[PDB]
Amino acid sequence: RKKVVLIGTGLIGGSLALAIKKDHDVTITGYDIFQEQVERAKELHVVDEIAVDLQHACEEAHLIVFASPVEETKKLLHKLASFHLREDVIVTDVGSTKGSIMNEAEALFSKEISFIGGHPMAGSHKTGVESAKAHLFENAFYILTPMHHVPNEHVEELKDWLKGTGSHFLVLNTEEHDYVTGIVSHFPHLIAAGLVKQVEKHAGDNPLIHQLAAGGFKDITRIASSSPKMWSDIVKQNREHLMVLLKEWISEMEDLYDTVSSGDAGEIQNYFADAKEYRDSLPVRK
Amino acid sequence: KKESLEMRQMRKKVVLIGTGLIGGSLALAIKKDHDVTITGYDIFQEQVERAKELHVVDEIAVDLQHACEEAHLIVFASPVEETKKLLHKLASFHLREDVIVTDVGSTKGSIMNEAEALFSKEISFIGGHPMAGSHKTGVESAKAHLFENAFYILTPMHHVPNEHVEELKDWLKGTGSHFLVLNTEEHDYVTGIVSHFPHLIAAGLVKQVEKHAGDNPLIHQLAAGGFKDITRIASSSPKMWSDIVKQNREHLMVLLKEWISEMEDLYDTVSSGDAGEIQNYFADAKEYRDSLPV
Ligand SMILES: NC(=O)c1ccc[n+]([C@@H]2O[C@H](COP(=O)([O-])OP(=O)(O)OC[C@H]3O[C@@H](n4cnc5c(N)ncnc54)[C@H](O)[C@@H]3O)[C@@H](O)[C@H]2O)c1
Ligand SMILES: NC(=O)c1ccc[n+]([C@@H]2O[C@H](COP(=O)([O-])OP(=O)(O)OC[C@H]3O[C@@H](n4cnc5c(N)ncnc54)[C@H](O)[C@@H]3O)[C@@H](O)[C@H]2O)c1
């Protein structure tokens, strides 16, 4: 049976490992700098083996998956370039940004290795391999950003490796990926955190706010409970897009202030009607 | 004559003005714990007819006056600007001396000022705000349990004695809500911060994304959990939210100026490129959100 290496045996890694095993009879060897995490992954039948030697495992693998944070993936690509991999190997990652990863891949592996950037656009904030599920990516978009030299059949192969995910796969270039995910994922995380911060500022002075924020406000700001480390890293890696979006946003807020100041019931109703038309225009998932 | 008889001959009467999500839900909660006749009135005939089909109301009111004049409890579940307008018509009617009148408006200041101007010392008007609901509209989506374990704010008029507030709590015990008596200024201040201002930001977030979606259709398609969860409330009734912004305009203007200053500070933090300061921003948000009770 074919061999898979999973580097980073956490929520997203474990989830992908389970989705592969669901639709494919394969040996998944796990590697993590956190021994307890990969040991637990083995206990839970998310991986079949723990890698002593990262080199031996990678050199025999048909598929290598990086589910490590993007800075750790970037560092480990340099090690992967020093190894003698199979000629047919497919290498992928799960990073929320693709710019840095694909630049590093182009510098190290051009023409030799099939590296395809990945971004499964779904996740529980519930963490660890403990919380990994085969169906975590069901009906979610999964972005693939192939290197320049990668032929189409290798992208279709990777889609087949990951068909167990139940995801809608979409090929984007790096620039498209970081632009759209900056607007639809990264920027909303910034606003959610800011919304929680503004409410906390008032909660200090009135404890009823703390009691009432536990209802509707807590539910809509769920993403603000995501890993601060992970999201600091994402903001750093998509900083230029997010800076341009924040200046747009401040200008949008100055226009909304002018609308509310005007006191025009019709203009205020138009504002909400326009937002409602767009929000209702998004398709229902699963 | 009813003074010769110790026992009630006919069950008590409730009027529901506005037979929609919140109105229907409250009607169902009242009927759960009380044997009463609920008569429905709505400017939308289809809505009140459907409310009657679904056994949310027992009767449809032809005449708003006749219905109100025989009612023990009158509930306004109309949008807040429509409630405010309807109070002057209620003041022209000859209601029962024991009547309790309440609303479920998301804002209370404008409504209670109108009530004080019309009914002082005569009518027991108690403002209401159930702190539970949905972006979904219509009696079709109404549920008896919608307010279970949610706060329900009451803003009694200055003259209303405690026993009438306790009566209204008993009328609405079926809600399973935690009832809380607030003044109008406290209510509109806290709901402005926790509910009204977030609705403005959700709509703004949708508007900013739409500006880019025009030029790149993938933005529309790739919108996921992060975007969809925080913007769900932008699907709420524009009429309802235009009314709320009008009735809490001065607080929302002050909160928007704070917000713009907060966003200017966040821009300086992201511009600095300091991973620690950016991490502190998210860590502070996470520690507060995790500190809210469950
Ligand atoms: N969590 C999400 O919502 C989400 C969604 C899509 C993509 N992603 C991407 O997936 C990555 C992982 O997310 P997660 O939720 O699985 O995080 P996680 O912490 O649950 O798992 C990441 C794992 O990588 C391991 N790791 C760290 N450095 C490593 C190294 N040098 N070698 C090997 N393993 C290493 C960690 O020990 C951990 O087990 C994120 O950094 C992000 O880029 C996350
Ligand atoms: N939706 C929520 O989450 C929520 C929560 C708490 C309070 N509220 C408040 O409840 C009230 C109604 O909200 P909803 O969610 O039930 O809305 P809705 O649109 O589902 O129902 C309101 C109903 O009132 C009717 N109506 C409008 N103007 C009227 C008028 N002049 N006379 C009679 N009927 C009229 C509408 O036709 C509709 O059936 C609003 O004041 C709103 O602020 C809403």
Side-chain angles (χ1 to χ4, degrees), chain A residues 1-111 113-285, chain B residues 1-2 4-294:
Chain A
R1 76 206 209 166
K2 286 148 139 220
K3 302 179 149 178
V4 180
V5 174
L6 176 57
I7 306 170
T9 61
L11 172 77
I12 304 296
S15 298
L16 279 172
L18 286 174
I20 294 165
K21 282 176 141 302
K22 184 173 154 287
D23 278 62
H24 301 290
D25 181 23
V26 304
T27 303
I28 307 188
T29 297
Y31 183 86
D32 204 306
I33 48 157
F34 193 166
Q35 194 177 325
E36 294 98 333
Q37 270 274 283
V38 62
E39 282 173 356
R40 186 85 190 105
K42 195 204 151 79
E43 288 178 40
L44 288 172
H45 309 302
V46 172
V47 302
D48 303 294
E49 304 285 8
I50 302 175
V52 33
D53 192 13
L54 194 57
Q55 190 165 356
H56 174 73
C58 292
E59 286 191 346
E60 67 180 12
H62 300 81
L63 179 64
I64 301 172
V65 183
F66 288 97
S68 43
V70 166
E71 293 328 293
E72 297 302 308
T73 304
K74 277 172 65 145
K75 286 141 116 166
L76 284 164
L77 292 196
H78 296 267
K79 297 311 152 188
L80 199 73
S82 80
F83 303 167
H84 299 306
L85 307 177
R86 299 177 57 92
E87 190 175 342
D88 60 352
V89 74
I90 298 173
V91 188
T92 192
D93 83 316
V94 303
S96 307
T97 50
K98 299 261 63 75
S100 299
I101 287 293
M102 298 308 303
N103 224 65
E104 205 79 9
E106 293 293 343
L108 290 169
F109 314 134
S110 270
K111 296 147 299 185
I113 288 145
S114 293
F115 188 84
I116 306 169
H119 184 193
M121 285 198 71
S124 184
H125 77 250
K126 212 156 53 81
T127 354
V129 68
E130 330 274 326
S131 311
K133 303 171 185 194
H135 59 270
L136 198 80
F137 312 119
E138 196 87 52
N139 301 135
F141 286 96
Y142 198 135
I143 314 300
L144 301 183
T145 67
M147 284 181 72
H148 300 315
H149 74 266
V150 175
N152 200 55
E153 54 179 309
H154 291 172
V155 187
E156 290 295 320
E157 274 174 45
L158 180 60
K159 288 193 190 194
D160 182 68
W161 272 111
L162 306 178
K163 67 179 154 156
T165 60
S167 295
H168 306 294
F169 287 98
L170 205 62
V171 175
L172 295 186
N173 68 50
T174 282
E175 314 98 74
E176 278 165 346
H177 172 277
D178 293 346
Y179 175 76
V180 305
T181 61
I183 293 169
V184 305
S185 175
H186 304 156
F187 179 69
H189 273 74
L190 274 179
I191 296 309
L195 210 50
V196 171
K197 220 148 184 295
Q198 174 116 348
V199 172
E200 176 183 41
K201 189 201 182 322
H202 295 284
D205 300 287
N206 198 330
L208 186 40
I209 292 173
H210 187 86
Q211 279 299 305
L212 292 177
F217 183 72
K218 187 185 195 218
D219 299 331
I220 70 157
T221 59
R222 191 143 200 94
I223 62 177
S225 288
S226 307
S227 169
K229 171 55 178 167
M230 183 174 103
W231 278 97
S232 45
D233 286 10
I234 290 164
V235 167
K236 280 287 296 208
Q237 282 300 8
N238 215 8
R239 183 172 159 275
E240 293 91 340
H241 280 127
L242 289 176
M243 280 165 60
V244 163
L245 292 175
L246 274 173
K247 274 290 174 205
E248 276 172 36
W249 176 247
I250 287 160
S251 166
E252 188 57 46
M253 293 300 95
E254 276 161 4
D255 293 354
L256 176 61
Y257 177 87
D258 290 343
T259 297
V260 170
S261 287
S262 80
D264 195 299
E267 296 302 324
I268 297 159
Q269 200 183 268
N270 287 345
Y271 194 84
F272 285 116
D274 292 345
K276 173 179 172 51
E277 199 212 11
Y278 187 74
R279 187 57 177 78
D280 288 351
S281 80
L282 308 180
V284 38
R285 178 206 164 186
Chain B
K1 178 174 53 60
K2 266 267 203 140
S4 304
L5 296 169
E6 299 181 34
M7 291 297 134
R8 292 204 61 81
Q9 295 312 291
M10 291 310 183
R11 72 206 205 169
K12 287 176 155 211
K13 298 178 155 173
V14 180
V15 174
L16 177 56
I17 305 172
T19 60
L21 171 74
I22 306 297
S25 299
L26 207 65
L28 288 171
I30 291 165
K31 284 186 80 63
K32 183 185 273 175
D33 279 62
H34 301 288
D35 182 21
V36 303
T37 304
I38 307 197
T39 303
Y41 173 95
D42 204 300
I43 52 158
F44 207 151
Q45 202 60 20
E46 294 210 341
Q47 270 274 284
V48 61
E49 281 176 11
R50 188 83 187 106
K52 196 210 174 82
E53 290 174 47
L54 287 171
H55 309 302
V56 170
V57 304
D58 303 294
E59 309 283 5
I60 301 171
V62 288
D63 190 13
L64 189 64
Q65 188 165 358
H66 176 72
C68 292
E69 286 191 342
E70 67 180 11
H72 300 81
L73 178 64
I74 299 166
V75 181
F76 290 94
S78 41
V80 289
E81 287 277 72
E82 303 300 311
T83 304
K84 187 184 153 65
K85 285 170 219 176
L86 282 164
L87 291 192
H88 97 259
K89 294 110 180 175
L90 194 75
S92 81
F93 305 165
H94 278 62
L95 310 174
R96 299 178 56 94
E97 189 213 332
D98 61 350
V99 74
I100 299 180
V101 188
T102 191
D103 84 315
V104 296
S106 302
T107 44
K108 299 262 65 73
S110 303
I111 284 160
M112 296 313 300
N113 282 338
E114 192 67 9
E116 293 291 342
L118 292 167
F119 314 132
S120 272
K121 290 136 183 178
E122 53 168 29
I123 287 159
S124 281
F125 189 86
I126 308 175
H129 183 195
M131 304 288 309
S134 192
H135 64 284
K136 292 159 181 185
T137 58
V139 68
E140 295 210 316
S141 311
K143 302 172 178 196
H145 60 269
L146 189 71
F147 313 118
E148 211 95 50
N149 195 22
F151 287 100
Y152 199 134
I153 314 299
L154 301 184
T155 63
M157 284 181 68
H158 304 315
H159 77 267
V160 174
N162 295 38
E163 56 264 26
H164 291 172
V165 182
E166 288 300 325
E167 274 178 50
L168 180 61
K169 284 183 194 190
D170 184 69
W171 271 111
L172 305 181
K173 67 179 152 156
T175 61
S177 295
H178 306 293
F179 289 99
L180 200 51
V181 171
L182 292 190
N183 71 64
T184 236
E185 177 195 31
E186 197 149 16
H187 170 277
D188 287 357
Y189 176 76
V190 304
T191 61
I193 291 167
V194 159
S195 174
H196 306 156
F197 172 71
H199 273 72
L200 276 183
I201 295 311
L205 191 49
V206 166
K207 218 153 224 299
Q208 204 198 341
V209 168
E210 166 184 37
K211 274 185 337 174
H212 296 282
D215 299 291
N216 193 340
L218 295 176
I219 287 157
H220 185 276
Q221 162 149 296
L222 267 6
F227 183 71
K228 278 161 155 212
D229 274 34
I230 182 158
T231 61
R232 199 158 318 273
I233 60 181
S235 288
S236 303
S237 168
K239 167 57 178 172
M240 164 179 158
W241 279 97
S242 170
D243 283 15
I244 288 165
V245 168
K246 281 290 296 183
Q247 284 192 5
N248 216 7
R249 180 169 153 276
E250 295 84 359
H251 282 132
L252 291 175
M253 281 169 69
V254 165
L255 293 178
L256 276 174
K257 281 294 155 198
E258 277 170 30
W259 175 248
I260 287 161
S261 159
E262 188 56 42
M263 292 302 97
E264 275 161 0
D265 292 356
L266 174 65
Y267 180 86
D268 291 342
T269 296
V270 171
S271 284
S272 80
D274 196 299
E277 296 302 327
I278 298 160
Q279 199 183 315
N280 286 345
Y281 197 82
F282 286 115
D284 291 346
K286 175 166 165 60
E287 83 178 340
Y288 183 70
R289 193 192 166 267
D290 289 349
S291 83
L292 300 183
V294 86

